[PDB]
Amino acid sequence: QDLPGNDNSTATLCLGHHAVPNGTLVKTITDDQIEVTNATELVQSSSTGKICNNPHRILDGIDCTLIDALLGDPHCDVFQNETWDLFVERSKAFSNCYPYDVPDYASLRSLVASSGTLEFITEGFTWTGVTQNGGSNACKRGPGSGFFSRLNWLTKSGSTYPVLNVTMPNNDNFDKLYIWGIHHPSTNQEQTSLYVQASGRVTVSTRRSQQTIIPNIGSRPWVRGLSSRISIYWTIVKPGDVLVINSNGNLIAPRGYFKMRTGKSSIMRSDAPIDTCISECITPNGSIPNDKPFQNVNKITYGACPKYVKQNTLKLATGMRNVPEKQT
Amino acid sequence: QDLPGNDNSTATLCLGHHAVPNGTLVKTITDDQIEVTNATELVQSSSTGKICNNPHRILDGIDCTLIDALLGDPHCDVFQNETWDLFVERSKAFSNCYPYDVPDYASLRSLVASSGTLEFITEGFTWTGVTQNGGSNACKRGPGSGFFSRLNWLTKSGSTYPVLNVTMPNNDNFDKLYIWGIHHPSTNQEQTSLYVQASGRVTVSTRRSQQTIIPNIGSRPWVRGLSSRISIYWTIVKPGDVLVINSNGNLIAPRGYFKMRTGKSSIMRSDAPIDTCISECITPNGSIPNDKPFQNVNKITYGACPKYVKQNTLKLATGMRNVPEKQT
Amino acid sequence: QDLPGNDNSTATLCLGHHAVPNGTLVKTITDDQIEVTNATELVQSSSTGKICNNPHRILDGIDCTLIDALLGDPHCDVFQNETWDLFVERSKAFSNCYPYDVPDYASLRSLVASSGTLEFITEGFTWTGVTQNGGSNACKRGPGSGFFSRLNWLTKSGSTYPVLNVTMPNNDNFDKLYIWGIHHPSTNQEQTSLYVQASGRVTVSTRRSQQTIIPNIGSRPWVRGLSSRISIYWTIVKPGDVLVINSNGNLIAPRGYFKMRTGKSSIMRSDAPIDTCISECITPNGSIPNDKPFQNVNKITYGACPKYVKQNTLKLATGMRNVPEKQT
Amino acid sequence: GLFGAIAGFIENGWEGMIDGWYGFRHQNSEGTGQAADLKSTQAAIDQINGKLNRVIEKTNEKFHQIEKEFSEVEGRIQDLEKYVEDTKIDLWSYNAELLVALENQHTIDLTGSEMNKLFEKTRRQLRENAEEMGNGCFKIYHKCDNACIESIRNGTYDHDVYRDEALNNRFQIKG
Amino acid sequence: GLFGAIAGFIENGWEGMIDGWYGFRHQNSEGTGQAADLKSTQAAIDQINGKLNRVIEKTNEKFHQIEKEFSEVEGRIQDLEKYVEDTKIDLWSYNAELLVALENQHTIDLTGSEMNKLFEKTRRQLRENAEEMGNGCFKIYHKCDNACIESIRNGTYDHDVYRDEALNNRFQIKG
Amino acid sequence: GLFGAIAGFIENGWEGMIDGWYGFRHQNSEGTGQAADLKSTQAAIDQINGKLNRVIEKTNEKFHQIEKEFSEVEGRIQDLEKYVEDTKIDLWSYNAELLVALENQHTIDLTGSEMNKLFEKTRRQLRENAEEMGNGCFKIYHKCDNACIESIRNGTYDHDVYRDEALNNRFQIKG
Ligand SMILES: *[C@@H]1O[C@H](CO)[C@@H](O[C@@H]2O[C@H](CO)[C@@H](O[C@@H]3O[C@H](CO)[C@@H](O)[C@H](O)[C@@H]3O)[C@H](O)[C@H]2NC(C)=O)[C@H](O)[C@H]1NC(C)=O
Ligand SMILES: *[C@@H]1O[C@H](CO)[C@@H](O[C@@H]2O[C@H](CO)[C@@H](O[C@@H]3O[C@H](CO)[C@@H](O)[C@H](O)[C@@H]3O)[C@H](O)[C@H]2NC(C)=O)[C@H](O)[C@H]1NC(C)=O
Ligand SMILES: *[C@@H]1O[C@H](CO)[C@@H](O[C@@H]2O[C@H](CO)[C@@H](O[C@@H]3O[C@H](CO)[C@@H](O)[C@H](O)[C@@H]3O)[C@H](O)[C@H]2NC(C)=O)[C@H](O)[C@H]1NC(C)=O
Ligand SMILES: CC(=O)N[C@H]1[C@H]([C@H](O)[C@H](O)CO)O[C@@](O)(C(=O)O)C[C@@H]1O
Ligand SMILES: CC(=O)N[C@H]1[C@H]([C@H](O)[C@H](O)CO)O[C@@](O)(C(=O)O)C[C@@H]1O
Ligand SMILES: CC(=O)N[C@H]1[C@H]([C@H](O)[C@H](O)CO)O[C@@](O)(C(=O)O)C[C@@H]1O
Ligand SMILES: *[C@@H]1O[C@H](CO)[C@@H](O)[C@H](O)[C@H]1NC(C)=O
Ligand SMILES: *[C@@H]1O[C@H](CO)[C@@H](O)[C@H](O)[C@H]1NC(C)=O
Ligand SMILES: *[C@@H]1O[C@H](CO)[C@@H](O)[C@H](O)[C@H]1NC(C)=O
Ligand SMILES: *[C@@H]1O[C@H](CO)[C@@H](O)[C@H](O)[C@H]1NC(C)=O
Ligand SMILES: *[C@@H]1O[C@H](CO)[C@@H](O)[C@H](O)[C@H]1NC(C)=O
Ligand SMILES: *[C@@H]1O[C@H](CO)[C@@H](O)[C@H](O)[C@H]1NC(C)=O
Ligand SMILES: *[C@@H]1O[C@H](CO)[C@@H](O)[C@H](O)[C@H]1NC(C)=O
Ligand SMILES: *[C@@H]1O[C@H](CO)[C@@H](O)[C@H](O)[C@H]1NC(C)=O
Ligand SMILES: *[C@@H]1O[C@H](CO)[C@@H](O)[C@H](O)[C@H]1NC(C)=O
Ligand SMILES: *[C@@H]1O[C@H](CO)[C@@H](O)[C@H](O)[C@H]1NC(C)=O
Ligand SMILES: *[C@@H]1O[C@H](CO)[C@@H](O)[C@H](O)[C@H]1NC(C)=O
Ligand SMILES: *[C@@H]1O[C@H](CO)[C@@H](O)[C@H](O)[C@H]1NC(C)=O
């Protein structure tokens, strides 16, 4: 095309790719240590060590267990009508009120903890023919004897205890959770002294269910001067239903109902300090950043968190093979 | 080879691939919207809205619950000795017979529902010294009072309720499921009136097990004029074993046994209409076609169904990249 | 460079790859039978049929169930204070001692089986005012009548079964598991004869819990001449806690405690013969080699085993495509 | 695409090729015209059907399972029932999403492979008689009428037949 | 690497190329010099970002789950609670491990593909005027000054412009 | 295969090559001969061993799990126990099946890659002295005795040594 050139020479072009002096090792299908130019870590492996108090409502239980907050141990009256997204239960929580036990504590703690509210409505129960407001010197309301704020201990008026037979409709729009209980005396003399009859009986029923618990007289170990226990029970009454509480003795009566909610609330045991900062993923070790897809901090989590994995490191290559000419 | 020519010219060949004007978007490892020539949908996402009555045996419960069909609520006598692959429980099911409760209703409904049969064999139980066939005006057999067809309510004869002690061997080839119960009176006067003793007791035993239930006298809420309940219990008696029913009061006796089967039967709550058509996958929303590998209609399913997935669409590219002649 | 050669000729080089006459078929993403030069089987599908007694401690239960070894059925006194990694329960296991039942047998067998030890410490319980060491002609200790080695059947002194009220602290470093029980008489005359009162009662409590069981008088089926049963219960007492056993009748008292451990022990039902050989993976079908990643021998396993899969064969191609020229 | 033919050196597709997935277009001394290649079109199709059949196979039947909808608040056991199913659903959703992604990625490379294989094949056939103009077209350096184009397309093209003609006016260094 | 360019015919990388991932070096008629190619460097980068964004997306929120730490020995139900979570953890661990392996494998082939594509592209452009020395360098058989090198690199190189010159001293069978 | 060499341009395999996976046959001035290539044979083997070792590693020990066989009909809790295990087994079965499929697919492309890489490598070495006859054989256009064939095979072939000879009787447009 162009005219015969008076010169003659060639040129050389070489293609190639960069390489870095340092370079990270990564796993592959066929090798488990191959060095690439660059990688990114896919496993979150460390907590800040603090539960960020934002954006979830974190209620610190301080030295109360959620069940004591519910029953209303004097030292937990702080929590009345409280609300949470995550209730944090501290290892140092204690109780000091009448010795109780909750047969299936596990489910009561669960269903209270998901409801997320401790909102109490007092109802006009009328106990005809018994003495109300009994308390104990093991559960002190300040100077005096006392009891759980939400429970009502009924004993003999004058020298009898009648067959209590009360009712409380759920004419409301929502489910109502009633917590009640039965007192187990330690001696037969204690049984008759308080409730007159030799054997109490509590039957709590709705149209849908019934439960009859009979007390058990006997000595248990000394807890706060007492050898007696009360066992805790719960009844949910659906809208339109009726609660009928019938007893001839040993009843620990409900003073009304807790409202049930359906939300995203939970409870978590942790001694991690709550701090002001915003983090959506909470583990009992404190909050962790959900930038990475997987995490290895803890298998217990609340909120938008990375998926727990056994691996503490998983590198994703974000660059080609590193084939250096020199080294550094 | 051949000879020098007079004409001289070249030619041009070009390779290429088709492209479509329309074209579907699809996800990849490296992009999440790349346009291909063609895709196919892997998520089944819609029901016909009808439970096809073929090929599975679908028994519509109409207004009976499977447990009422079992106990034999008068309004469900239709189901006696019925059989199913899938029992469909309707939201509109009701019961109108003596108020009962089944402690662990959940397991009784399960094990009846997998057995798949309600075949009843009446056995010659002989209740010596008590009145049989008691019924209630809350459970009407037509004009009169009545009871569950498969249960036998025993009351005193004149002045006495004896300690019943009967036995019924399983000399048969199969396991026998016996449904029995205990009556809880609402008043003490009711207890003594019916069963003479102040406290009934029912112990049902085999060589392998025993259960003793004691009744609970007290007022429950009014259900069909009654403040009493009966609680339902079940005993499976293995081949070669013996059933011994012993009671001094409050027994609701079995009239024989249900046969147990081992099959592919289940129960499903659904208000979807049953219709004549053939579909192997059933969800409570109606049947769905199992051509696709995954589905998003419902997580509850019976039969050969696609795997439930959260995704409501997952497109599998079934063609190359679409690179059209002109993008706009 | 070199000088002109008279000859003028070319050469031919051909590249290619080996092929084998035989060749295995394998699945791919796009085909499910493609023939490769060589494959390796990834599913372990056969047992040796023998449980290798190494390296795990395998205790053969011979004709004892772990619960009978625990309670101490005479015919199982062999197992006292034994220890295992895997307890093997044989189909031919039987029991011949007083008829008992364990409400939630399932959890007692589990927690004993993971503890891995049957180490018994006798404690100085002092039963004041009752007769000890009662036995039965259905549970023979050699020529004579006897009972479970670890249980103590108490009956009255003279005309008195006092209210037993004993205590036993856990001043130790570890959790203690106490097994106790209650006797259910078959006749009322039997109840009063043995325990004087018309109704026994057993309450076993710690600071953390209580359980009160009341017996149930009635006829059960004849098992070894007896119509009575004893029901078995367990109480774990944490370090620092106290056990209080209180009863006025029908107590089957603990003679001390079992030590609880936390290890890798389990129990497995199998009739596979134990043999001397070393294999880390055990299934009830015998041991299997854990060279392959997956297995299809049994879903029940103990030790380092391949993952159970439904597939009985999964071939991993370990060679190229086989494209033969002859055929074979 | 790993091979760089589709959306690569072959700039774009032909909306006009309604009779196959891959094919040929030519301009020669007699006219122009197009024709789809059926062998690579089948190769692409059968692989896509193969994977499609494997993913469309094996529905597992399930009958009595666990209950998955509750209407009363129970606590611990119901909590577990809901956890078992929720973790099951999340694991299967992960599987369906990774499966179609992995698959789609592979289908684009597989169809792309077939393009480039047709090209390389046509390249080898033409031996010294054509030059790649790098846009997916070959310049054939000799008179190639419609039957010649039919023989390149049906794989019977004898390159020797035109080697001298081509070679001469290919390397006629005279301009 | 499937394509055999990186760690293959291109012996090693250049620690010196600090301005791109792939590029050119040239010995030429007015000095030796290097320059990174930005089009293949972006292609490599965007695919890696794409996969990276897909794996970094979608954290599932979970609120009230099952309890995963117990402090009392319960037996059967607690045994099941521990089994559900342990099997969940093992399944997700298998998934994270296979995912990064599968991915890493693919990233090495993808970046390797881009290398080989730049090479093939440069090859096609140079048409009959260069020969591959098989080490990732082309010998350009004609006088190619810095602007010529710039036009090969920016894809405007007209091969015809140097065809005669090249072709002549490429096939000068005279030695 | 993505690259189209095995079961592609290399029509079939050699049952006779008992000493390697890939190799050379030749027919030169002193007769015919075959010889396996050990470098590509190791490359293919080591990758296959690598993946094989990764899939053959890590058995998880499990000790006390949940009971998986029942002998009495219990209802709700037993229903859940069977569901947890059945869903576990189906998830792991899906994993084993997708794993060997994914793998097998990749092993066929990996061994195919090595074939094509050996080819391309031999191609580059021969520079202007050979033509591909497109069936996996190169026609070497100069007198190449057994030592010449040995040097192509051991990568020391100097193409310049035969460039003039080859080039001349390669392009002798005279027929
Ligand atoms: C049944 O047996 C139990 C245990 O043998 C008896 O419980 C013990 O009762 C005594 C007397 O009340 C308790 O004593 C008090 O203990 C506190 C704390 O150490 C101390 O400060 C007091 O000054 C007094 O000593 C003792 O703690 C308690 N022990 C246990 C383990 O609970 C019970 O009294 C017996 N019941 C009957 C009716 O016989
Ligand atoms: C214990 O307390 C409960 C609730 O306070 C009492 O239940 C109520 O009993 C009355 C009288 O039987 C029931 O009245 C009946 O209502 C139906 C429908 O209106 C009607 O057919 C009857 O003529 C009569 O009016 C009432 O429904 C029932 N209420 C509930 C919520 O169950 C029970 O009587 C008390 N028991 C004792 C022994 O005091
Ligand atoms: C309540 O009813 C049950 C069953 O009807 C009665 O049980 C039966 O009692 C008899 C007499 O003890 C048992 O007979 C024995 O059989 C063995 C074995 O053959 C034999 O060696 C003894 O000498 C004796 O004859 C019979 O096995 C037993 N049957 C069952 C199924 O347990 C029970 O006696 C009744 N109880 C009362 C208080 O009426
Ligand atoms: C209702 C009632 O009478 N409560 C009394 C109780 C009960 O007798 C015991 O708690 C039974 O265990 O005993 C006290 O000594 C106590 O310290 O609590 C005083 C208290 O007034
Ligand atoms: C066996 C028996 O005597 N049944 C009678 C019952 C029971 O007394 C109550 O159901 C106890 O709650 O009461 C009736 O009024 C009823 O309407 O059912 C009449 C019936 O004959
Ligand atoms: C403590 C005691 O008195 N045990 C006696 C028992 C019980 O009376 C029954 O087991 C109650 O069911 O009866 C025997 O006949 C027996 O064979 O075991 C003798 C034995 O000495
Ligand atoms: C709790 O909230 C309810 C809301 O209606 C209120 O009536 C009740 O008195 C409150 N009690 C306390 C202690 O805040
Ligand atoms: C998180 O806390 C657990 C115990 O709650 C501990 O075992 C674990 O190692 C901790 N992990 C990190 C990353 O802090
Ligand atoms: C490594 O990759 C990550 C993600 O692509 C990126 O943020 C990081 O900067 C990369 N490293 C370098 C040196 O670019
Ligand atoms: C139910 O089936 C059994 C089968 O033997 C029969 O004896 C029984 O009488 C049947 N009863 C009814 C109501 O169909
Ligand atoms: C199926 O029914 C459920 C409730 O049973 C409903 O929430 C869901 O959206 C329905 N899905 C379809 C596709 O009908
Ligand atoms: C898209 O792919 C599916 C499955 O391969 C097929 O049935 C459908 O017809 C394809 N679309 C077209 C236009 O061919
Ligand atoms: C069981 O072991 C303990 C260990 O202290 C010992 O005291 C006890 O006597 C042993 N009993 C038997 C029967 O071996
Ligand atoms: C293992 O044993 C089970 C029953 O325990 C049996 O069904 C299964 O087929 C056996 N498998 C092998 C490989 O022995
Ligand atoms: C097939 O592959 C396995 C694993 O790589 C190997 O042990 C076996 O020897 C191979 N077969 C042949 C004939 O080499
Ligand atoms: C290929 O095309 C040429 C020209 O039409 C024809 O002669 C030849 O027979 C064809 N061969 C085949 C196999 O179609
Ligand atoms: C390419 O480089 C040449 C030489 O510098 C220049 O003339 C030409 O315009 C450039 N083209 C582009 C698109 O950069
Ligand atoms: C390659 O083969 C030739 C001919 O036998 C020999 O001279 C040369 O040294 C060989 N080189 C190597 C590295 O084997």
From Swiss-Prot, chains A, B, C:
Extracellular side: 1-328
Residues carrying sugar: N8, N22, N38, N81, N165, N285
SS bonds (residue pairs): C52-C277, C64-C76, C97-C139, C281-C305
Protein name: Hemagglutinin HA1 chain
Lineage: Viruses, Riboviria, Orthornavirae, Negarnaviricota, Polyploviricotina
Gene behind this protein: HA
Shown residues within the full chain: 17 to 344 of 566
